[PDB]
Design a protein around this motif. Structure first.
Motif, mmCIF file in Angstrom:
data_model
loop_
_atom_site.group_PDB
_atom_site.id
_atom_site.type_symbol
_atom_site.label_atom_id
_atom_site.label_comp_id
_atom_site.label_asym_id
_atom_site.label_seq_id
_atom_site.Cartn_x
_atom_site.Cartn_y
_atom_site.Cartn_z
ATOM 1 N N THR A 240 50.896 18.440 39.530
ATOM 2 C CA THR A 240 51.565 17.400 38.746
ATOM 3 C C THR A 240 50.886 16.037 38.806
ATOM 4 O O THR A 240 50.755 15.387 37.766
ATOM 5 C CB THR A 240 53.041 17.269 39.198
ATOM 6 O OG1 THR A 240 53.726 16.335 38.354
ATOM 7 C CG2 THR A 240 53.133 16.792 40.627
ATOM 8 N N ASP A 241 50.448 15.583 39.987
ATOM 9 C CA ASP A 241 49.858 14.248 40.114
ATOM 10 C C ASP A 241 48.898 14.189 41.293
ATOM 11 O O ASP A 241 49.293 14.551 42.414
ATOM 12 C CB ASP A 241 50.952 13.184 40.282
ATOM 13 C CG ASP A 241 50.426 11.769 40.110
ATOM 14 O OD1 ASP A 241 49.460 11.404 40.809
ATOM 15 O OD2 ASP A 241 50.978 11.024 39.266
ATOM 16 N N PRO A 242 47.657 13.734 41.091
ATOM 17 C CA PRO A 242 46.674 13.736 42.182
ATOM 18 C C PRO A 242 46.755 12.540 43.120
ATOM 19 O O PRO A 242 46.016 12.511 44.111
ATOM 20 C CB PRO A 242 45.337 13.743 41.428
ATOM 21 C CG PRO A 242 45.626 12.996 40.169
ATOM 22 C CD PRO A 242 47.070 13.258 39.822
ATOM 23 N N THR A 243 47.617 11.558 42.849
ATOM 24 C CA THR A 243 47.676 10.363 43.683
ATOM 25 C C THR A 243 48.081 10.713 45.110
ATOM 26 O O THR A 243 49.103 11.367 45.337
ATOM 27 C CB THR A 243 48.670 9.354 43.102
ATOM 28 O OG1 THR A 243 48.411 9.169 41.705
ATOM 29 C CG2 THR A 243 48.551 8.011 43.826
ATOM 30 N N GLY A 244 47.286 10.250 46.074
ATOM 31 C CA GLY A 244 47.605 10.433 47.475
ATOM 32 C C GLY A 244 47.225 11.774 48.065
ATOM 33 O O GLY A 244 47.567 12.041 49.223
ATOM 34 N N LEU A 276 50.891 20.045 48.765
ATOM 35 C CA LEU A 276 52.272 19.605 48.608
ATOM 36 C C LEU A 276 52.335 18.250 47.907
ATOM 37 O O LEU A 276 53.228 18.007 47.084
ATOM 38 C CB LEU A 276 52.968 19.548 49.967
ATOM 39 C CG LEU A 276 53.232 20.889 50.661
ATOM 40 C CD1 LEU A 276 53.922 20.668 52.001
ATOM 41 C CD2 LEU A 276 54.062 21.820 49.787
ATOM 42 N N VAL A 277 51.391 17.357 48.214
ATOM 43 C CA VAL A 277 51.372 16.060 47.538
ATOM 44 C C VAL A 277 50.907 16.213 46.092
ATOM 45 O O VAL A 277 51.458 15.586 45.179
ATOM 46 C CB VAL A 277 50.500 15.063 48.322
ATOM 47 C CG1 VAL A 277 50.169 13.844 47.471
ATOM 48 C CG2 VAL A 277 51.221 14.635 49.590
ATOM 49 N N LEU A 278 49.904 17.064 45.858
ATOM 50 C CA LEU A 278 49.433 17.318 44.500
ATOM 51 C C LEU A 278 50.554 17.820 43.598
ATOM 52 O O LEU A 278 50.542 17.555 42.392
ATOM 53 C CB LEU A 278 48.291 18.333 44.528
ATOM 54 C CG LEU A 278 47.748 18.778 43.169
ATOM 55 C CD1 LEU A 278 47.104 17.606 42.440
ATOM 56 C CD2 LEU A 278 46.755 19.917 43.332
ATOM 57 N N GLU A 279 51.516 18.550 44.161
ATOM 58 C CA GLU A 279 52.607 19.150 43.407
ATOM 59 C C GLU A 279 53.832 18.249 43.310
ATOM 60 O O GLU A 279 54.890 18.707 42.870
ATOM 61 C CB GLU A 279 53.004 20.490 44.041
ATOM 62 C CG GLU A 279 51.919 21.558 43.930
ATOM 63 C CD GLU A 279 52.226 22.813 44.728
ATOM 64 O OE1 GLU A 279 53.206 22.815 45.501
ATOM 65 O OE2 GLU A 279 51.482 23.805 44.575
ATOM 66 N N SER A 280 53.714 16.987 43.711
ATOM 67 C CA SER A 280 54.770 16.001 43.533
ATOM 68 C C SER A 280 54.180 14.764 42.867
ATOM 69 O O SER A 280 52.963 14.573 42.827
ATOM 70 C CB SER A 280 55.428 15.640 44.870
ATOM 71 O OG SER A 280 54.478 15.629 45.919
ATOM 72 N N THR A 281 55.058 13.919 42.329
ATOM 73 C CA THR A 281 54.592 12.756 41.579
ATOM 74 C C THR A 281 54.148 11.639 42.516
ATOM 75 O O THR A 281 52.969 11.263 42.540
ATOM 76 C CB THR A 281 55.690 12.264 40.632
ATOM 77 O OG1 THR A 281 55.972 13.279 39.660
ATOM 78 C CG2 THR A 281 55.256 10.982 39.913
ATOM 79 N N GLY A 282 55.072 11.090 43.291
ATOM 80 C CA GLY A 282 54.729 10.055 44.251
ATOM 81 C C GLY A 282 53.815 10.603 45.333
ATOM 82 O O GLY A 282 53.471 11.772 45.365
ATOM 83 N N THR A 283 53.410 9.705 46.251
ATOM 84 C CA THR A 283 52.553 10.086 47.371
ATOM 85 C C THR A 283 53.338 10.510 48.605
ATOM 86 O O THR A 283 52.796 11.229 49.453
ATOM 87 C CB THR A 283 51.639 8.917 47.753
ATOM 88 O OG1 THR A 283 52.443 7.785 48.119
ATOM 89 C CG2 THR A 283 50.739 8.538 46.586
HETATM 90 NA NA NA Z 1 50.935 13.050 43.892
#
Ligand code: NA
Ligand SMILES: CSc1ncnc2c1ncn2[C@@H]1O[C@H](CO)[C@@H](O)[C@H]1O
Ligand SMILES: CSc1ncnc2c1ncn2[C@@H]1O[C@H](CO)[C@@H](O)[C@H]1O
Ligand SMILES: CSc1ncnc2c1ncn2[C@@H]1O[C@H](CO)[C@@H](O)[C@H]1O
Ligand SMILES: CSc1ncnc2c1ncn2[C@@H]1O[C@H](CO)[C@@H](O)[C@H]1O
Ligand code: NA
Lengths: 313, 314
Positions: A240-244, A276-283
């Motif tokens: 979902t989101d690569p941030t963090g 787990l972080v890649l699969e969530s929006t925030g960090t």
């Molecule tokens: Na993320």
């Protein structure tokens, strides 16, 4: 006890339901959320969630109160976060497209005052940390932190990431020598070599371990003698989101190391936290499920590795 | 009374002290970050109110709109017909501007998507028939329904699609243009409108009462259907800082001048003044109206006579 130095920020994360293939760029986004962030905040949060002893060492604004509570609930020691008289906590604004490409702006704000933080006070308060992460931060803060680690005899991990492109060859060189760990991604490794003028051997002769993340291809752990451990990714299911993601890997890996795990097992744990972080929006929006962690570790790396990893958590 | 329909937003404006010359992974270290009132409809309504015009804002926002409402009402804007969403937050525009005034921005519509539930009939029944309705960048369906309802109730309207022109189809743009008393675009947007609708210049002019085409530093063109063209140069800038909202400012100044009985050229000169005042401030509604400075800059750019006639009606 791990001392995490680096940026503390609020992340304003947006999703562009297209591909960045467009100066007057305008992206109609379909998601906008605000989360806790900054590389130091991310890594400290992840270490605290995993059960490690961690102290956050960075600069923020007076608005930090809620963030502090949020981190203290997870065991992070925030006593040594510098609170600015004037400036707001740094803000990272990012738009991520469907390919996980990102277009972002970073406003440092209070981050610029990290150069006034003194690790001597931290050591006098909590003892000498087992490791100090020199993460992306105010450049002068990064250099002063590294030099004070050298002078006070503290092991450190050079983790310049986002600041590598903004530093000169000499500055990057001053950050690398003597590091117990060097963290970059592959593009950042190539850039570090080109900018410092160092060869790969030149770098490895000055550090105890190179850790080079390779995105979907996993991570490499390279020792000065050439011994290389390649750890594949924990395959993702809901990207979902690569941030963090890199911060997450570093936190999981260093938690595993502090728990007595070997290099490979620590990198496997780091890969789990990273996905787990890649699969969530925030960090810091991910959840630690012990059974799901064991299951995904076993699927990726084998029952024995999964069991050994979960034993120390 | 001018009814301004369009986006209501909070603008998060940043300054990149460089030039945008950078698996995309762009990261801009910015040295300024400010939050201001925005949205094209909010900008235009604010400007009309400041200039002394009679104006009603007609758009969708969130419950967070209270302070914005106070800010606009203090300037004489009628906010009774702003739709307040039960659920969504006010739209947010996020923009980074480089040293060349180039911009990279993201827009989150939020509550803006609910403007399609607004009914201009309620506005007319509450305040009477507006002398003109500005159909500015908004929820696309809201733009279309607003234009059709203007046609149905016989209200004059100004097609002002601006930021939405690149996101609408040819048929959609065509349905927005027919019957407009004014058409506002910039030159690039004029070329894009022609290319997308398949209309020729003559095809467009036969369906509108006036084309207004802003040309950035080159000024503005006012073109009548018979080819009569008034070109008004800019009020030269002294402290260029941020281009956000400059077009809205020009439209507001021009339409205020028009509602005050000024001719096309004088109205465009006033619009140019407000536009440069916005260009020289960061936010879109961060400018101040100084009567003496306005008169002086108008006179310097266009002559004492034009300046006097303009300031007389304000
Ligand atoms: Na993320
Ligand atoms: C000079 S650019 C910069 N410097 C320091 N930290 C940065 C920067 N850009 C983004 N971040 C923070 O990194 C986190 C993701 O690793 C995100 O949480 C984000 O806040
Ligand atoms: C872009 S793919 C990727 N990158 C980093 N960590 C991962 C990934 N997939 C699972 N864990
Ligand atoms: C679908 S993109 C979009 N739609 C509607 N309005 C937009 C958009 N992008 C920016 N704005 C608003 O325009 C104002 C400047 O004219 C700025 O104040 C800003 O809020
Ligand atoms: C130099 S750009 C400029 N200058 C003055 N007025 C303007 C401009 N653009 C729109 N209105
Ligand atoms: Na501006």
């Amino acid at each position: 006890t791990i001392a995490v130095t680096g940026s503390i920020a609020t992340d304003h994360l947006m999703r562009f339901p297209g591909r960045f293939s467009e100066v007057s760029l305008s992206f109609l986004v379909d998601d906008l959320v605000m989360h806790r962030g900054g590389v130091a905040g991310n890594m400290a949060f992840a270490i605290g969630v995993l059960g490690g002893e961690v102290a956050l060492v960075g600069a923020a604004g007076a608005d930090f109160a809620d963030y502090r509570d949020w981190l203290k609930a997870r065991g992070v020691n925030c006593d040594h976060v510098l609170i600015s008289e004037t400036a707001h906590t740094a803000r990272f604004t990012c738009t991520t497209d469907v390919d996980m490409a990102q277009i972002a702006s970073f406003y440092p704000g209070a981050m610029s005052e990290a150069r006034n933080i003194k690790l001597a006070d931290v050591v006098s308060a909590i003892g000498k940390p087992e490791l100090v992460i020199i993460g992306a931060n105010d450049p002068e803060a990064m250099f002063l932190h590294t030099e004070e680690c050298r002078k006070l005899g503290l092991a450190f991990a050079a983790d310049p990431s986002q600041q590598l492109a903004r530093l000169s060859g000499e500055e990057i060189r001053r950050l690398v020598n003597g590091a117990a760990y060097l963290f970059t991604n592959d593009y950042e490794w190539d850039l570090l070599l080109s900018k410092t003028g160092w060869s790969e051997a030149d770098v490895m002769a000055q550090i105890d371990l190179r850790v080079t993340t390779l995105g979907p291809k996993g991570v490499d752990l390279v020792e000065p003698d050439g011994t290389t451990i390649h750890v594949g990714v924990v395959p993702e299911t809901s990207q979902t989101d690569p941030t963090g993601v890199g911060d997450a890997f570093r936190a999981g890996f260093l938690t595993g190391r502090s728990a007595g795990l070997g290099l490979e097992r620590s990198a496997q744990l780091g890969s789990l936290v990273a996905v787990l972080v890649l699969e969530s929006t925030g960090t810091q929006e991910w959840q630690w499920d012990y059974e799901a962690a064991a299951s995904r570790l076993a699927g990726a790396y084998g029952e024995h590795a999964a069991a050994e990893i979960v034993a120390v958590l």
